[PDB]
Amino acid sequence: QPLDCDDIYAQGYQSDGVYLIYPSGPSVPVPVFCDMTTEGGKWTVFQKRFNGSVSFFRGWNDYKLGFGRADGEYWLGLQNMHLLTLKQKYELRVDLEDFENNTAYAKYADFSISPNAVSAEEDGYTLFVAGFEDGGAGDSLSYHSGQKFSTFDRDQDLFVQNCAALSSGAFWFRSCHFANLNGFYLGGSHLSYANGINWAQWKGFYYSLKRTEMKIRRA
Amino acid sequence: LQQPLDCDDIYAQGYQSDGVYLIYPSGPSVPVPVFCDMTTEGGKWTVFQKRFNGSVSFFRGWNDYKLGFGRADGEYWLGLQNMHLLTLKQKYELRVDLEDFENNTAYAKYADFSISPNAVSAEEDGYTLFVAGFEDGGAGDSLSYHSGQKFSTFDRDQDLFVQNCAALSSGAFWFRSCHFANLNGFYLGGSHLSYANGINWAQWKGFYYSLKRTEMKIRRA
Amino acid sequence: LQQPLDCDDIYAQGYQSDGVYLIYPSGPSVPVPVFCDMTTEGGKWTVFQKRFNGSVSFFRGWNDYKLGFGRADGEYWLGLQNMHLLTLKQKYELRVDLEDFENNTAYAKYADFSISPNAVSAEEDGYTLFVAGFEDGGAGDSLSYHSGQKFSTFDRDQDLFVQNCAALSSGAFWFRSCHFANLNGFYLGGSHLSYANGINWAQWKGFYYSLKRTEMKIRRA
Amino acid sequence: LQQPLDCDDIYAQGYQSDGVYLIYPSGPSVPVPVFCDMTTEGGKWTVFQKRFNGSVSFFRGWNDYKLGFGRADGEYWLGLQNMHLLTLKQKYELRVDLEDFENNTAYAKYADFSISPNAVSAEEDGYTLFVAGFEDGGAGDSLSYHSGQKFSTFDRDQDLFVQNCAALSSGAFWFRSCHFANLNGFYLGGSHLSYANGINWAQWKGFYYSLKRTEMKIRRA
Amino acid sequence: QQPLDCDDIYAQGYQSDGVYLIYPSGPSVPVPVFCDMTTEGGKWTVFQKRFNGSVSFFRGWNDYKLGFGRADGEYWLGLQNMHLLTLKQKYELRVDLEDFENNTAYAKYADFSISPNAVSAEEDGYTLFVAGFEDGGAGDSLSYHSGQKFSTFDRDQDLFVQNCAALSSGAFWFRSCHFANLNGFYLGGSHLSYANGINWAQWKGFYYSLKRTEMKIRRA
Amino acid sequence: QQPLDCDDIYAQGYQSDGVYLIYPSGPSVPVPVFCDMTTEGGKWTVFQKRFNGSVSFFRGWNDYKLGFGRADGEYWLGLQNMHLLTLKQKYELRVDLEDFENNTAYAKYADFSISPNAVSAEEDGYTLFVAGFEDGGAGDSLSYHSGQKFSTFDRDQDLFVQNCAALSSGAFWFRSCHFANLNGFYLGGSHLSYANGINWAQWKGFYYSLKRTEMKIRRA
Amino acid sequence: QPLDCDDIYAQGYQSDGVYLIYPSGPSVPVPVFCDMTTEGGKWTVFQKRFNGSVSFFRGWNDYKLGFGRADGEYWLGLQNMHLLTLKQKYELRVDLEDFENNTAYAKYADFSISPNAVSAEEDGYTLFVAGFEDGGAGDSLSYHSGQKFSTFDRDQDLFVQNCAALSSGAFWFRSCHFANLNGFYLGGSHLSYANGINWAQWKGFYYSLKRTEMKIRRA
Amino acid sequence: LQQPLDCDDIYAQGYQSDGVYLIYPSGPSVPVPVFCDMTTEGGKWTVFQKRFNGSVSFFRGWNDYKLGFGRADGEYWLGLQNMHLLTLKQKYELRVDLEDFENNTAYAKYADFSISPNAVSAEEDGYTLFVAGFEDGGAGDSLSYHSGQKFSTFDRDQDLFVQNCAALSSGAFWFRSCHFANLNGFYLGGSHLSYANGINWAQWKGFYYSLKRTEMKIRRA
Ligand SMILES: [Ca+2]
Ligand SMILES: [Ca+2]
Ligand SMILES: [Ca+2]
Ligand SMILES: [Ca+2]
Ligand SMILES: [Ca+2]
Ligand SMILES: [Ca+2]
Ligand SMILES: [Ca+2]
Ligand SMILES: [Ca+2]
């Protein structure tokens, strides 16, 4: 059984598409989309957005189990992500695109959800990212490292207010985000503050991207 | 030793200044505070919905919308159960008052208004919304599209849509295929390029405009 | 002042037109609307069961039958809990009124009627049905067979039968080995080739005929 | 030490007699028994639905229909979760075989069949039914009307109708405004005067005819 | 005007012992009970009756909170109801027992309360309190139980490593284990198993299951 | 490599009867059981043991599903586990009994299964199936029970208007009522009560409670 | 029915002790101890401590429904408190005593739990206190006004950490308390910081009182 | 392939630096990280308990203590279920390591250690603690008093005391009448005037002294 998608590369499949991996165990699979093309491939994608159809302003439960279609926009589920990061060391890549036909990305050498936590729930699925290699976009996620995942159901952020509610999304919020890749799909520039799909360092807080996907690969 | 269950009684009690007041919709055991608009169109308005600051988030669950949530001073939602108790024992009239970011006001009135009327159990009937004859104010008629629909949240999908229209609209309402009025949407503060997710009154400012103030008022028959 | 808990109270309040009314069986906290037959045999009837249109499906679960379900206007079931509160604090008389598809009317009266009488908890006792002295109307005596039997649903099989008599009969009732009266059966609208699964009153039109209209009425002593 | 997860594997194992067999859709830890129709049209059919006696009641809850219920020997339902595990990891073909009380047989085939395909969580997506190209057998095409609809029960109403079409129909199905096929309805054994609540295939025997036998079969692509 | 206990019913003007409605919660909902208006001046509210052995008292923590049975025959009034009475008035206890040899016995306790002066009965586990004991035919078993939370196979509150409620086939305010198991299995006479029947230790020991049993309550 | 039953343990190379770990669900979680590697060639998995009388078997439906007790002494393996074994292999039944007069007896049944060919054991109530019976000392009581769901005072599945599980002081696949109640109350010898102890009707009748009892399972 | 204890004064009872009042309604009472002696009496007590036996490091549910014995130490319950303050205007008095045979107190004219809130739960049962009349002790509660009630179950405080956990108690915490009348009963001076029954303005953060009770009376 | 279920296996795998490691007590499906003391007395210690900073609160519920809670790096509790999985399949030795605020160290060793040994279900048996032969280190023998006692929390009281000793002690432990060792008490940081509520080892520093560091280690037989 392949638990990640780098295993699937070894299985003998290299066309990027929907695939079944067994992160828990052989009992139940979960379908994911894999980017076998970008930078040698072997990417497991836990986050996809482009159409704007699927709303990512969901509750803590949907974000734990995952939600959406492996074909189009989806969120793999925080629990699944924890099972992968728990048993193997992983690398992060996020790939972004605006409405001006420009692409950008940012890479982080290490990436883990609640690393070395006896229970991910108790630890709030903390996000950890280490060494950052710069692509097109800047470094927004390093600001978020060490923060529990927050939703309008469960406020874990360091802000007196509910930053997840104010930002129209879910993320590992601090005082408030520099990256809200689950914000509301406002499709271009917006006059509201830091509530759309925003990567602060690339296009600021008042610009909502067109496409967004966060990729994961073995060490 | 006599209790006012609605706010039109408070008018009869002898109080006409609009403000916070205690009314007993359940019974003399426990009251619930509300804000009353004793000024607009003769007064006697019981308000079950207020929004203006945008601070309070209305993307809440089915339980919060059943029991009610917020501050009677500022933004709040009275609670679906309370609303059902009032409309169950008296016939009521609806008025909604709206305001945009261009210093313009509008409204719409509905002669009859009830939540799940003559329903032996509101839960089983899903707290259906009923509105009848519509008298035009500044805004158009959006709510008549919603009459007969159960109240839906991201917890409980009652809408007629394959998707969860409450989830797509970032709010709670008596949804059909999807709303013409989402007065519990996200407070996006002005125009927005996203589709039908803010505090939107379709017939007045369309689906791509988020209002500034919003309040839904109720008075005896 | 005291609240009217039954509909004979409402007669004393000064209302004699049969229609939807609010009575407070639990307490002043929450009412439940019911339809009252102020016309039949002097009136003052509280109706805990209505069927005629066939629209509402009565093949529901134990929870819907405990809390009640339907519209006080048309077809509905008041809910066993409410029924227990009435019979617990007052002595009541039963009348069931029936009509077939041949423009014929019939009825049956039972002097005493109670749900789980002298039971410290109605749930534990399964809301046992008790009916006493029977005065003959158009129909025969089918309910006397059912007295002493817990209320059974496809959720909760309480009947004395090895099978699920509630499931085989497409309804809910105080079943024994199996019913002679299934006034919550499936609305099969006339004659049917299936056995004892429609709205059936055995002694009047047998097990292979489903009535058109049905309502079970309750009045003070 | 090698496990057959579907029943086309069992054909490859070296077994071709139609009967009860163990397959491992989840994994080698726990199997789930199913009946396989290795005779019809080349065989290799995995059956997730059987009805004929009418004894087993299919008016069950969302939980019973998620985990599955019944006997692989006689009437049963394999379970929505299991069905989702198979369709998730392989592409499958659908065949439903029907029989009336007049000694007639019919069927309908669909090239593609999947429950909530490519869904990261079946619960969130409501276990939608998808069927593609339809090859006609004896019966017409009722299921294409149902494609894209979440599975609904009287516990969980997902249909596009204001009412609870699962409750009105006395069964569970991927309901829309309401079904053209209710293969989990009440086994009324022949014709019925009530509307669209029995085991009905609309295009073959209409809404007022309840089949005698029913079974839904699945094979690899 | 509503009678909340059965000594009120004496004042209402009813003295024939039978099933009656009292309002311990409030005028909203009554709960029926059987009252023994005959024994020792009357005014007894009965929260426990057993005689046929038909009703099984091996029930869960929830049934014992809300109560179960028929006020006519065997029943249990319910721990919540009992706490409502003992919370608002001071009460006296009497238990009346009978064996299979046509003998009667009893025991009286001056004070009786369930979790007295407790802001929430659930949190305190509905502790039993009994004070000064006046001897009748039977001995004093309940004084051993005073201060103990009510235990069932659902909720083990006893002081024993094992589940004394499970071993005793009943429910009671168990300590290390009972001297009185008035909710045990109705084994109807002698039994070779240990301390699992309707047993009053001080009257007929641990290997004797009574025939009839009822626990009565009256105002102070 | 993991042994799911105890005939696997026989092949592992262990033949001394005692507590062993087997993995009926899967390699994730084991459950310990006692194996009778002595009787009739051995390889017996024991899902039921009684002798001391200490452990009470008048338990709820949840305890009987998940199992309860110590694999050393008296215990019940748990119906869920029992269902996983019978689901994936065909099994043979043997029950071994002993009274208080130093006499032994037994009964064997060729086929034995819990909820066979059931897509979910819960829905089917964990029905008992037993086929061909080879006579030992005791008679055939279980054939009366074949096809009956498992019943407890929590869940009455029996064919009786009353609650046969409650009247019998135990849990079993009851019909109108049992001829074998091997989970009854440990009444330790003769008893004047009717059919509420550990009783095998065909060997020592309804008024005699055995001393030792254990129900064994082996591969086909 | 008397819903408060000033009604009980009118009922005709003036000896301070355990009494039943009906704050919800005639359906269910809740016992309280009333101080009919202090400053004319008519005090309803929602808080008592002296023996130290009852532990006040409890959960949010125990503090909503209440816990303890009306005889000795107890907590009336936040919900009950809300029913009183919702329908009548009330005055606050807290009475304190150290281990040196000294007494002190502080009075606040207005006192309310979640005033004008359609649901107390949603508002977290905010504490409001207005004009303060000085007794022996200083003014610690004015710092707490406007803060939701917090427990180790539910962190509502404005502090990044869980101030309820650090203080060994439950209170309407801000950055952290000046008054922790539900702290751990450390019985005198303690070297730990602000975790005992502490009234900051009277005996500082390193002194745990001996007796404590918070009293309420009609307007 | 080849998975280490304990940390003595990790010694054989070839890792001897004390730190966080993955071991598979359930199975190869899901690991759980633990910290191992490969240094003390030859190493191979699996640590199910660590405390030193005082930051993590151990006044948690029965569910958190069943599933485990904390960070394997710093303070944590491995979880009662995992502990039962280890002790169920192998025989283990116990060592507890203690340190005060006076730069002194102590410990106590127990030859046998088990959670609910030979229990068909840990829940039913309440996860009883068993410890046998005791070898004296710096500290005395407090745990022998606790052997045979179920694990108790303020959620679930299993102790032999009329009160809730877990609640009075501000921690969780296998309580009897009350503890001689409360290694999950509140981190009061030194001496305290309250009775038996801090991280206390009675026989070493009594009931009025709260330790600075605490960790309970486990090794194969
Ligand atoms: Ca926050
Ligand atoms: Ca929908
Ligand atoms: Ca039955
Ligand atoms: Ca619907
Ligand atoms: Ca115990
Ligand atoms: Ca039965
Ligand atoms: Ca905080
Ligand atoms: Ca205790």
PDB file of C-alpha atoms in Angstrom, chain B residues 16-176:
ATOM      1  CA  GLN B  16     -42.085  54.893  24.182  1.00  0.00           C
ATOM      2  CA  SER B  17     -38.322  55.536  24.253  1.00  0.00           C
ATOM      3  CA  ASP B  18     -36.545  53.091  21.961  1.00  0.00           C
ATOM      4  CA  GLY B  19     -34.008  51.044  23.884  1.00  0.00           C
ATOM      5  CA  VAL B  20     -33.326  47.792  25.682  1.00  0.00           C
ATOM      6  CA  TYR B  21     -36.355  46.199  27.332  1.00  0.00           C
ATOM      7  CA  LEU B  22     -37.313  42.910  28.972  1.00  0.00           C
ATOM      8  CA  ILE B  23     -40.135  40.842  27.465  1.00  0.00           C
ATOM      9  CA  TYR B  24     -41.345  37.378  28.491  1.00  0.00           C
ATOM     10  CA  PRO B  25     -41.983  35.287  25.356  1.00  0.00           C
ATOM     11  CA  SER B  26     -41.638  31.964  27.167  1.00  0.00           C
ATOM     12  CA  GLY B  27     -43.274  32.942  30.432  1.00  0.00           C
ATOM     13  CA  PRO B  28     -42.856  34.881  33.674  1.00  0.00           C
ATOM     14  CA  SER B  29     -40.043  32.497  34.693  1.00  0.00           C
ATOM     15  CA  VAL B  30     -37.270  33.778  32.392  1.00  0.00           C
ATOM     16  CA  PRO B  31     -37.177  36.974  30.287  1.00  0.00           C
ATOM     17  CA  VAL B  32     -35.008  37.728  27.259  1.00  0.00           C
ATOM     18  CA  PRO B  33     -33.832  41.306  26.510  1.00  0.00           C
ATOM     19  CA  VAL B  34     -34.464  42.895  23.109  1.00  0.00           C
ATOM     20  CA  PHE B  35     -34.104  46.308  21.488  1.00  0.00           C
ATOM     21  CA  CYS B  36     -37.327  48.025  20.390  1.00  0.00           C
ATOM     22  CA  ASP B  37     -37.772  50.740  17.753  1.00  0.00           C
ATOM     23  CA  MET B  38     -40.610  52.761  19.258  1.00  0.00           C
ATOM     24  CA  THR B  39     -39.919  55.597  16.751  1.00  0.00           C
ATOM     25  CA  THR B  40     -40.198  54.181  13.233  1.00  0.00           C
ATOM     26  CA  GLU B  41     -43.704  54.258  11.686  1.00  0.00           C
ATOM     27  CA  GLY B  42     -45.558  54.663  14.962  1.00  0.00           C
ATOM     28  CA  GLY B  43     -43.166  52.429  16.896  1.00  0.00           C
ATOM     29  CA  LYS B  44     -44.059  49.218  18.732  1.00  0.00           C
ATOM     30  CA  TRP B  45     -41.354  47.394  16.754  1.00  0.00           C
ATOM     31  CA  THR B  46     -39.737  44.305  18.269  1.00  0.00           C
ATOM     32  CA  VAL B  47     -36.303  43.793  16.720  1.00  0.00           C
ATOM     33  CA  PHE B  48     -35.085  40.207  16.264  1.00  0.00           C
ATOM     34  CA  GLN B  49     -32.031  41.140  14.156  1.00  0.00           C
ATOM     35  CA  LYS B  50     -29.525  44.029  14.308  1.00  0.00           C
ATOM     36  CA  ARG B  51     -26.303  44.633  12.396  1.00  0.00           C
ATOM     37  CA  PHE B  52     -24.179  47.733  11.830  1.00  0.00           C
ATOM     38  CA  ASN B  53     -20.694  47.424  13.358  1.00  0.00           C
ATOM     39  CA  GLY B  54     -19.829  44.163  11.620  1.00  0.00           C
ATOM     40  CA  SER B  55     -17.983  43.122  14.793  1.00  0.00           C
ATOM     41  CA  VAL B  56     -20.241  40.226  15.773  1.00  0.00           C
ATOM     42  CA  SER B  57     -19.897  37.328  13.345  1.00  0.00           C
ATOM     43  CA  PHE B  58     -23.232  35.896  12.208  1.00  0.00           C
ATOM     44  CA  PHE B  59     -21.685  32.761  10.657  1.00  0.00           C
ATOM     45  CA  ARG B  60     -22.873  30.709  13.627  1.00  0.00           C
ATOM     46  CA  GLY B  61     -24.203  27.193  14.098  1.00  0.00           C
ATOM     47  CA  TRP B  62     -27.731  25.820  14.207  1.00  0.00           C
ATOM     48  CA  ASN B  63     -27.691  25.808  18.008  1.00  0.00           C
ATOM     49  CA  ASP B  64     -26.574  29.431  18.334  1.00  0.00           C
ATOM     50  CA  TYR B  65     -29.282  30.459  15.878  1.00  0.00           C
ATOM     51  CA  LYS B  66     -31.912  28.449  17.769  1.00  0.00           C
ATOM     52  CA  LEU B  67     -31.086  29.825  21.226  1.00  0.00           C
ATOM     53  CA  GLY B  68     -30.135  33.334  20.089  1.00  0.00           C
ATOM     54  CA  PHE B  69     -26.859  35.207  20.329  1.00  0.00           C
ATOM     55  CA  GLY B  70     -25.484  38.711  20.783  1.00  0.00           C
ATOM     56  CA  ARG B  71     -26.100  41.893  22.748  1.00  0.00           C
ATOM     57  CA  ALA B  72     -29.466  43.652  22.777  1.00  0.00           C
ATOM     58  CA  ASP B  73     -27.486  46.913  22.776  1.00  0.00           C
ATOM     59  CA  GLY B  74     -25.625  46.378  19.506  1.00  0.00           C
ATOM     60  CA  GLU B  75     -25.721  43.594  16.935  1.00  0.00           C
ATOM     61  CA  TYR B  76     -27.657  40.475  17.891  1.00  0.00           C
ATOM     62  CA  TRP B  77     -30.049  37.730  16.816  1.00  0.00           C
ATOM     63  CA  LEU B  78     -33.018  37.063  19.063  1.00  0.00           C
ATOM     64  CA  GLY B  79     -33.158  33.291  18.484  1.00  0.00           C
ATOM     65  CA  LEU B  80     -35.365  31.116  16.322  1.00  0.00           C
ATOM     66  CA  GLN B  81     -37.164  29.516  19.262  1.00  0.00           C
ATOM     67  CA  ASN B  82     -38.137  32.896  20.773  1.00  0.00           C
ATOM     68  CA  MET B  83     -39.339  34.078  17.355  1.00  0.00           C
ATOM     69  CA  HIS B  84     -41.465  30.948  17.086  1.00  0.00           C
ATOM     70  CA  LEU B  85     -43.011  31.605  20.514  1.00  0.00           C
ATOM     71  CA  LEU B  86     -44.105  35.130  19.523  1.00  0.00           C
ATOM     72  CA  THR B  87     -45.529  34.308  16.084  1.00  0.00           C
ATOM     73  CA  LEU B  88     -47.224  31.217  17.540  1.00  0.00           C
ATOM     74  CA  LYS B  89     -49.482  33.140  19.945  1.00  0.00           C
ATOM     75  CA  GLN B  90     -50.043  36.383  17.993  1.00  0.00           C
ATOM     76  CA  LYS B  91     -50.211  37.505  14.365  1.00  0.00           C
ATOM     77  CA  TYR B  92     -47.340  39.790  13.398  1.00  0.00           C
ATOM     78  CA  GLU B  93     -46.200  42.201  10.686  1.00  0.00           C
ATOM     79  CA  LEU B  94     -42.661  42.412   9.276  1.00  0.00           C
ATOM     80  CA  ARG B  95     -40.512  45.407   8.355  1.00  0.00           C
ATOM     81  CA  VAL B  96     -36.817  45.294   7.429  1.00  0.00           C
ATOM     82  CA  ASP B  97     -34.791  48.520   7.328  1.00  0.00           C
ATOM     83  CA  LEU B  98     -31.566  48.679   5.310  1.00  0.00           C
ATOM     84  CA  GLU B  99     -28.753  51.143   4.691  1.00  0.00           C
ATOM     85  CA  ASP B 100     -25.796  51.132   2.295  1.00  0.00           C
ATOM     86  CA  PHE B 101     -22.474  53.018   2.398  1.00  0.00           C
ATOM     87  CA  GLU B 102     -23.849  55.913   0.284  1.00  0.00           C
ATOM     88  CA  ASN B 103     -26.138  57.424   2.976  1.00  0.00           C
ATOM     89  CA  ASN B 104     -29.288  55.896   1.464  1.00  0.00           C
ATOM     90  CA  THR B 105     -32.120  54.139   3.282  1.00  0.00           C
ATOM     91  CA  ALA B 106     -34.680  51.604   2.091  1.00  0.00           C
ATOM     92  CA  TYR B 107     -37.150  49.095   3.487  1.00  0.00           C
ATOM     93  CA  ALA B 108     -39.772  46.461   2.708  1.00  0.00           C
ATOM     94  CA  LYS B 109     -42.899  45.463   4.647  1.00  0.00           C
ATOM     95  CA  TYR B 110     -44.821  42.174   4.750  1.00  0.00           C
ATOM     96  CA  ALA B 111     -48.359  42.051   6.111  1.00  0.00           C
ATOM     97  CA  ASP B 112     -48.252  38.562   7.657  1.00  0.00           C
ATOM     98  CA  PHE B 113     -45.161  36.991   9.190  1.00  0.00           C
ATOM     99  CA  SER B 114     -44.725  33.752  11.123  1.00  0.00           C
ATOM    100  CA  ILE B 115     -42.102  31.113  11.897  1.00  0.00           C
ATOM    101  CA  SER B 116     -43.508  27.616  11.369  1.00  0.00           C
ATOM    102  CA  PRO B 117     -47.092  28.719  12.087  1.00  0.00           C
ATOM    103  CA  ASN B 118     -49.466  26.153  13.575  1.00  0.00           C
ATOM    104  CA  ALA B 119     -46.618  23.639  13.853  1.00  0.00           C
ATOM    105  CA  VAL B 120     -46.939  21.258  16.793  1.00  0.00           C
ATOM    106  CA  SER B 121     -43.116  21.088  16.881  1.00  0.00           C
ATOM    107  CA  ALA B 122     -40.870  23.737  15.350  1.00  0.00           C
ATOM    108  CA  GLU B 123     -37.864  21.388  15.169  1.00  0.00           C
ATOM    109  CA  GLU B 124     -39.746  18.797  13.095  1.00  0.00           C
ATOM    110  CA  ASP B 125     -41.020  21.549  10.786  1.00  0.00           C
ATOM    111  CA  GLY B 126     -37.549  23.131  10.655  1.00  0.00           C
ATOM    112  CA  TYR B 127     -38.813  26.596  11.632  1.00  0.00           C
ATOM    113  CA  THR B 128     -40.284  27.380   8.229  1.00  0.00           C
ATOM    114  CA  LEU B 129     -40.581  31.056   7.312  1.00  0.00           C
ATOM    115  CA  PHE B 130     -43.930  32.354   6.039  1.00  0.00           C
ATOM    116  CA  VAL B 131     -44.546  35.828   4.604  1.00  0.00           C
ATOM    117  CA  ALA B 132     -47.694  36.952   2.778  1.00  0.00           C
ATOM    118  CA  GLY B 133     -48.767  40.292   1.199  1.00  0.00           C
ATOM    119  CA  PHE B 134     -45.833  42.608   0.515  1.00  0.00           C
ATOM    120  CA  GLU B 135     -45.986  46.412   0.707  1.00  0.00           C
ATOM    121  CA  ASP B 136     -43.116  48.052  -1.149  1.00  0.00           C
ATOM    122  CA  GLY B 137     -40.690  50.439   0.502  1.00  0.00           C
ATOM    123  CA  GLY B 138     -37.296  51.496  -0.818  1.00  0.00           C
ATOM    124  CA  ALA B 139     -36.067  47.955  -1.514  1.00  0.00           C
ATOM    125  CA  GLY B 140     -37.733  45.264  -3.601  1.00  0.00           C
ATOM    126  CA  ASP B 141     -39.334  41.959  -2.607  1.00  0.00           C
ATOM    127  CA  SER B 142     -36.673  39.345  -1.789  1.00  0.00           C
ATOM    128  CA  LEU B 143     -38.308  37.453   1.092  1.00  0.00           C
ATOM    129  CA  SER B 144     -41.368  36.157  -0.807  1.00  0.00           C
ATOM    130  CA  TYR B 145     -38.943  33.869  -2.633  1.00  0.00           C
ATOM    131  CA  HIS B 146     -37.962  32.409   0.760  1.00  0.00           C
ATOM    132  CA  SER B 147     -41.441  31.728   2.171  1.00  0.00           C
ATOM    133  CA  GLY B 148     -42.029  28.087   3.049  1.00  0.00           C
ATOM    134  CA  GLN B 149     -38.336  27.250   3.526  1.00  0.00           C
ATOM    135  CA  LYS B 150     -36.760  25.758   6.622  1.00  0.00           C
ATOM    136  CA  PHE B 151     -33.888  27.569   8.304  1.00  0.00           C
ATOM    137  CA  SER B 152     -30.496  26.245   7.215  1.00  0.00           C
ATOM    138  CA  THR B 153     -26.971  26.421   8.625  1.00  0.00           C
ATOM    139  CA  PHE B 154     -23.656  24.726   7.848  1.00  0.00           C
ATOM    140  CA  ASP B 155     -24.651  22.386  10.699  1.00  0.00           C
ATOM    141  CA  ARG B 156     -28.077  21.524   9.233  1.00  0.00           C
ATOM    142  CA  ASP B 157     -28.626  21.725   5.463  1.00  0.00           C
ATOM    143  CA  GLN B 158     -32.358  22.154   4.772  1.00  0.00           C
ATOM    144  CA  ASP B 159     -32.078  24.073   1.478  1.00  0.00           C
ATOM    145  CA  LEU B 160     -33.370  22.761  -1.846  1.00  0.00           C
ATOM    146  CA  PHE B 161     -29.836  22.897  -3.299  1.00  0.00           C
ATOM    147  CA  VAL B 162     -27.560  19.887  -3.749  1.00  0.00           C
ATOM    148  CA  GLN B 163     -24.811  21.986  -2.188  1.00  0.00           C
ATOM    149  CA  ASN B 164     -25.030  23.645   1.239  1.00  0.00           C
ATOM    150  CA  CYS B 165     -26.179  27.132   0.258  1.00  0.00           C
ATOM    151  CA  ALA B 166     -25.655  28.313   3.831  1.00  0.00           C
ATOM    152  CA  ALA B 167     -22.011  27.286   3.456  1.00  0.00           C
ATOM    153  CA  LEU B 168     -21.637  28.909   0.030  1.00  0.00           C
ATOM    154  CA  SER B 169     -23.272  32.137   1.253  1.00  0.00           C
ATOM    155  CA  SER B 170     -21.282  32.418   4.534  1.00  0.00           C
ATOM    156  CA  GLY B 171     -24.452  32.895   6.538  1.00  0.00           C
ATOM    157  CA  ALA B 172     -27.738  31.447   7.745  1.00  0.00           C
ATOM    158  CA  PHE B 173     -31.174  31.921   6.196  1.00  0.00           C
ATOM    159  CA  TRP B 174     -34.297  30.124   4.975  1.00  0.00           C
ATOM    160  CA  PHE B 175     -32.580  29.091   1.772  1.00  0.00           C
ATOM    161  CA  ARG B 176     -34.173  27.655  -1.378  1.00  0.00           C
TER     162      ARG B 176
END
